[PDB]
Amino acid sequence: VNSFSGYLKLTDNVYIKNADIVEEAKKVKPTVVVNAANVYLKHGGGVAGALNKATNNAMQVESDDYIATNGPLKVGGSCVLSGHNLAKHCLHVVGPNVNKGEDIQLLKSAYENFNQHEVLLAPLLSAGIFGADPIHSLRVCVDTVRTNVYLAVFDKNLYDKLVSSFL
Numbered sequence: 336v337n338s339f340s341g342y343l344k345l346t347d348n349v350y351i352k353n354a355d356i357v358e359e360a361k362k363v364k365p366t367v368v369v370n371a372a373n374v375y376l377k378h379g380g381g382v383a384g385a386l387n388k389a390t391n392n393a394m395q396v397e398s399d400d401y402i403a404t405n406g407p408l409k410v411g412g413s414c415v416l417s418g419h420n421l422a423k424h425c426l427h428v429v430g431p432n433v434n435k436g437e438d439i440q441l442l443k444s445a446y447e448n449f450n451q452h453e454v455l456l457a458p459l460l461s462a463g464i465f466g467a468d469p470i471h472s473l474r475v476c477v478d479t480v481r482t483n484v485y486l487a488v489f490d491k492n493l494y495d496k497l498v499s500s501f502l
């Protein structure tokens with residue numbers, strides 16, 4: 336039993352809610368919140384900009400030190416950093432950005448990072464301003480992640496479309 340509330344069960348291990356991931360994290364304080372990051376951990380907009388703003392820019396400060404030490408992530412890769420006031424940990428995961436011309440097949444590799452964590456609060460990777468098809472991303476999530484994932488989908492119209500089309 337966990338403290339996630341109001342989710343629709345999609346499969347044995349995947350759950351979904353029309354909610355802002357920032358608000359879900361504030362309420363639940365999950366062990367792991369997933370950020371939809373880029374390879375430079377520049378949290379300018381989208382999920383990343385919203386999470387970082389909620390940390391009062393502490394996520395960005397920590398991220399800049401991470402990059403200075405380690406260099407950029409790979410597309411499809413991840414790193415574990417602090418969750419600050421939102422969660423114990425933040426798993427920064429880089430899905431392919433279609434608006435940058437990145438290969439959509441790397442989306443499966445991106446979701447594989449979730450399997451290193453027993454329970455996660457996550458956004459839909461590569462959706463929104465990353466330019467991929469959200470129906471496809473939900474499908475890849477369900478077919479790749481085996482651990483327990485709670486998907487917060489902020490956009491109400493998108494949430495309705497995802498539920499009504501889910502096979």
Ligand SMILES: Cc1cccc(C[C@H](CO)Nc2ncnc3[nH]ccc23)c1
Binds near residue numbers: 355356382459460464
């Ligand atoms: C990768 C990506 C970037 C930009 C947008 C989206 C779409 C999703 C779903 O609508 N956005 C969100 N989902 C959950 N919590 C959120 N908080 C603020 C925005 C937001 C995906």
